[PDB]
Amino acid sequence: LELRLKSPVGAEPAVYPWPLPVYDKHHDAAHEIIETIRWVCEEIPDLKLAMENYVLIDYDTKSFESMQRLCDKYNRAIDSIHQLWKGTNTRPSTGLLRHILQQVYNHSVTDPEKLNNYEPFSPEVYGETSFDLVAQMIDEIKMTDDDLFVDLGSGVGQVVLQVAAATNCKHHYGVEKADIPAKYAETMDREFRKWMKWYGKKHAEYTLERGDFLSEEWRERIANTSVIFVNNFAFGPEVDHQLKERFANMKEGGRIVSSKPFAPLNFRINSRNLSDIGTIMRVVELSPLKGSWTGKPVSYYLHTIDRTILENYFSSLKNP
Numbered sequence: 001l002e003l004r005l006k007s008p009v010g011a012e013p014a015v016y017p018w019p020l021p022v023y024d025k026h027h028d029a030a031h032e033i034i035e036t037i038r039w040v041c042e043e044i045p046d047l048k049l050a051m052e053n054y055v056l057i058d059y060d061t062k063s064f065e066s067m068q069r070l071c072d073k074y075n076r077a078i079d080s081i082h083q084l085w086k087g088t089n090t091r092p093s094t095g096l097l098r099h100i101l102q103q104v105y106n107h108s109v110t111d112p113e114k115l116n117n118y119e120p121f122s123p124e125v126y127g128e129t130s131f132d133l134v135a136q137m138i139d140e141i142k143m144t145d146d147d148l149f150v151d152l153g154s155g156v157g158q159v160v161l162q163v164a165a166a167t168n169c170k171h172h173y174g175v176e177k178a179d180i181p182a183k184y185a186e187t188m189d190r191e192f193r194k195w196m197k198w199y200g201k202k203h204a205e206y207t208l209e210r211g212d213f214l215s216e217e218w219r220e221r222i223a224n225t226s227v228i229f230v231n232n233f234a235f236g237p238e239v240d241h242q243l244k245e246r247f248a249n250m251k252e253g254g255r256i257v258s259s260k261p262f263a264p265l266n267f268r269i270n271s272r273n274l275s276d277i278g279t280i281m282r283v284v285e286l287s288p289l290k291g292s293w294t295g296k297p298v299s300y301y302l303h304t305i306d307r308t309i310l311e312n313y314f315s316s317l318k319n320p
């Protein structure tokens with residue numbers, strides 16, 4: 001007993017067992033099947049024509065025969081369209097990406113109890129504000145092929161997968177120290193690549209890793225990163241202090257996107273604060289409410305390595 005969904009690009013079919021898995025009280029694999037068919041029909045206009053109207057209105061998620069009717073109607077339409085293309089990979093849309101990331105998480109994080117995360121910006125609630133906030137950030141930082149993106153404490157890899165699907169960075173890295181999210185990130189990686197192939201969607205190169213970003217190996221790695229992303233909201237003072245030390249080795253124009261600023265927004269250099277990281281970096285608050293945002297009143301911080309802050313203070317002492 002199983003349900004099969006044919007790929008719009010001829011990849012290996014999506015195979016679901018019956019009874020279908022349940023994700024939570026209001027979310028299950030049946031709704032995922034319905035939403036996948038709908039997204040495929042949205043992106044392929046010919047497919048919508050081929051597929052009968054009623055099929056997506058009258059379905060019973062709790063009926064094997066009903067779900068199988070729904071799956072067969074889609075598959076036949078996939079077959080009709082593949083015969084039409086016989087007679088002679090882009091980036092996913094934002095909408096489709098939200099669906100893919102949720103789908104990848106649903107298939108990967110099978111026991112979310114195991115995460116022990118009660119934080120408001122945790123993997124279990126990613127689609128709520130994070131997806132939209134990360135999307136707002138991608139539009140604001142505007143990375144190129146010369147950039148290398150690192151998420152320090154990447155969890156199950158959701159930020160890395162979103163940025164990789166949206167940008168053209170040389171490479172995207174995610175580093176996670178903790179055992180449980182790092183083991184789930186291995187499945188997230190497999191599922192992401194499988195589903196992206198199924199939809200026929202392109203993504204940048206990315207690596208999800210297990211490791212301590214405060215290690216010796218990661219000192220030179222932070223130093224050579226152009227865009228660092230770090231949710232440092234719960235970070236201790238020692239972790240904060242150590243990170244500032246790693247950031248002090250970054251190149252001019254290097255950027256750090258974070259939840260809490262690493263330097264005051266109103267930092268003013270003087271004879272007493274010359275050790276502070278604020279002497280070598282600009283800091284701005286980016287709030288989607290300032291930048292048609294109707295979500296949570298959230299903000300993130302953009303830091304830019306700029307050693308001219310320090311250079312100017314010295315030139316000012318030498319040239320009054």
Ligand SMILES: O=C(c1ccc2ncccc2c1)c1c(Cl)cccc1Cl
Nearest residue numbers: 121130133134137231233258259300
């Ligand atoms: O990680 C965050 C994030 C942001 C704000 C937060 N506010 C309070 C608590 C945690 C938080 C985490 C993030 C960042 Cl830094 C940039 C872009 C998109 C996202 Cl989702």
